[PDB]
Structure formats: structure tokens, C-alpha cells
């Protein structure tokens, strides 16, 4: 059997940001979907590839497990075929994606009284990324008329820290999102 280490993702107590999502390739282990039931109350447990009831009966050669924390309104953009600031510059899924997206509320775990600034998202960029590709470039973004190459006039950094505090609205509260990608 040797069940897959799902506890290391859903119960890591140290999550990666959306621009550096912790890609974990699931292989050589039986996908035990029982721990997914206990690790979350299933806020946005919605699949697009296969039905959840027959998850344990299928067979896959390559399975991916991503993880990233975003605001509440940005979870609806993790579905295949969306456009925004997270579905374009931080994360991308193909149109024929076969998997499930697990999102739940972590306002009591990722929100600090003085503000949890460890979560940043890329707001603006020139072009949009490719599915399952990362962008950890810290080079400042150019938006002005002349090449600035400091953050001078109309030149800003692409990242931006999340407004996560326990008093923020549930739309802006930290929502930990997990994606179980499958390949046939």
C-alpha cells in the first residue's frame, strides 16, 4: 500500500506562496483519499476531471500535488479556464485539466494580528504563464515610458503582499488551495 504523504501538504504548518507553489509529484504510492476528508471540512471540494466517488478505483501514472494560499474571491479562478491575477501570473491549469481543487478557510491559521506579510502574489506582468510553470523572477516590472531598469516613475515590483489579518472579511481571508493534478 504505502499511502501517499498527503499529510505533508494539507498539514504542513508552513505553506508556500502562490508565486512559489510547492509542487509535489505524487508517484509510487496509493492515493488514499481518506485523509483528504479529515484534513478539511471541504469548503470548495470540486472536481473537473473525474468523480470523487471513484477516485480510489482509478489508476494514474503521474499525479501532481500543488499548494498555495490566496484570498477568497481568487479561488473561483483556480478552475480551468479563468482569467485574473492568480490564474495568469502565479498559477495556470490547462483547458483539458483532469483533477480536483481543494480550498478551505484558514483565517485562524494564516492570519497574524500584526498582518501576515509572508504571502505575496504577482499583480502585473507582461505576458501570462504556461500551465504547470513557475515564475520566481524578482526583477522589477517595467511600466513607464523610458527604461528605468529603482522603483522610479511608473516602475513597480510585480509582487504584492496579501492583506491577511483575522479581522479581514472572509473574501480577503486566507484560503489554502490544493490541486491534485492527474495525467493519463
Amino acid at each position: 500500500t504505502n499511502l501517499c504523504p498527503f499529510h505533508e501538504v494539507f498539514n504542513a504548518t508552513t505553506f508556500a506562496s502562490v508565486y512559489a507553489w510547492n509542487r509535489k509529484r505524487i508517484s509510487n504510492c496509493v492515493a488514499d483519499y481518506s485523509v483528504i476528508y479529515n484534513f478539511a471540512p471541504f469548503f470548495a471540494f470540486k472536481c473537473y476531471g473525474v468523480s470523487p466517488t471513484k477516485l480510489n478505483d482509478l489508476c494514474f501514472t503521474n499525479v501532481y500535488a500543488d499548494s498555495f494560499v490566496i484570498r477568497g474571491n481568487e479561488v473561483s479562478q483556480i478552475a480551468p479556464g479563468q482569467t485574473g491575477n492568480i490564474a495568469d501570473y502565479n498559477y495556470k491549469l490547462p483547458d483539458d485539466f483532469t483533477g480536483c481543487v481543494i480550498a478551505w478557510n484558514s483565517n485562524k491559521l494564516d492570519s497574524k494580528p500584526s498582518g501576515n506579510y509572508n504571502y505575496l502574489y504577482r499583480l502585473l506582468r507582461k505576458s501570462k504563464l504556461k500551465p504547470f510553470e513557475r515564475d520566481i523572477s524578482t526583477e522589477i516590472y517595467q511600466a513607464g515610458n523610458k527604461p528605468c531598469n529603482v522603483a522610479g516613475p511608473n516602475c513597480y515590483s510585480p509582487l504584492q503582499s496579501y492583506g491577511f489579518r483575522p479581522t479581514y472579511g472572509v473574501g480577503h481571508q486566507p484560503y489554502r488551495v490544493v490541486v491534485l493534478s492527474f495525467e493519463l
Partner: antibody
Amino acid sequence: QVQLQESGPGLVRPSQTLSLTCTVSGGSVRNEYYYWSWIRQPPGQGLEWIGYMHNSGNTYYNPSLKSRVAISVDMSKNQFSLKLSSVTVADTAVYYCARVDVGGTLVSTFDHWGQGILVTVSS
Amino acid sequence: EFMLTQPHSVSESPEMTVTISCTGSSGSIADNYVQWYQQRPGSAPTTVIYENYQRPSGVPNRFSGSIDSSSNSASLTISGLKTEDEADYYCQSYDNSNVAVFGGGTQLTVLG
């Protein structure tokens, strides 16, 4: 409009627990962007916040009434209850249930209140 | 630890203006919202001011709120008082640890 109503025994004994229920008529406990709260008020004193809870399970309590309160929700009948254990004679008060707005980018006003229920913890 | 301290009693004759206040002893008062609730004796509280400036539907224009971050306090300005305005006005806000902090309570009494 949305309205709330408290219900429970109007007389308790020490070393026991106080259990009240707040049936939500006109709304839905399933609705997010809202915290379901319980408020306390001793006779002749000011309001005292007991705690609220999000329908997803995020429970926030008063730092003084911790380890003695327990608020839960029931999606079946659109109700949420209060469980205040280890009651003493000083817990005689009028108990209110209210909901708070958590949609406008921050936690906000207690938009809808109940009607008030008086309990007398006596021995 | 975040507190709100209101005056114990405020009283002005009709057609005058009262200013119920509340000072945040700890924390800050601009970092969260400040709401004001009116509780008549024998009834439930009622929102009169939310988002620190706005009045809910049905609330008359005689009420108005304000926030001063220099002194770390809030206020509830009421003008043109009438016989139905005398009630207990509470100053409610939040701590950054997500704790609803109510004020001690100000019993407004319109003199007759």
C-alpha cells in the same frame, strides 16, 4: 427581514451548563460572509461579547469566557446554539444572539439581533 | 487586549447636541471598524452607525459618527434630540485578534 429568537430554560443551577438555541428565521446559517454570535448582558450592566462562529467552523471566543463557552451550528434547521458550562450565580444575565457582517473586506456591525432571554443561575 | 471606555452618563435638553465618545485604552481605533448600538431598556441592541461613518436604513439623519486617530477615540454626534432618543448607547469595535469589544455603555437621558 431576517430575525432571530432565543429559546431555552429560563432557570439554571450552579455546576450545570446553560444551553440556549437561536433559530434563524428569514436567513440561512449556510450563508457565508456572516458570523453567528452570542451576546450577554447582566441586569443593570453593559453588553458582553461571548463569541461568534463562522459556518465553516472558525470559532472566536471572548478571552475571558474561554474554556467555558461552546458555540455550534446546525445546517439542518438553520440554528446555532450556545453551551456555557460551569455556571455560577454571577452568570445571571439576559442572553442575546446576533449575526455580524464579514463581507465588506472586514468584520463589521452586528446587523441583526434577537429579543433577549433571561436566565437565573440559582441554587 | 483592546478596550473601549465611554462616559458613564450624558444628558442634554431637547434640540441640543450630545457627543458620546469612547477612547481605545489599548490597540488602535483606526485599524478596525467602530459601530454604535442603541439599547432601550427592555429591547435588543440596534445598529445606528457602522463603517465608522454610515447609517443603516431607517436610521434618521440626527445621528453621526466620527473617528480621531490622534487621540485614539471614537464619537457619536447626535443633534436635535427628542424624547425617543434617551437610551443606552454602546460603542462597539474589534481587536486585531478578532474579538468584538463593546463599550462600557453610556446612558443618554434627554432632560425633561
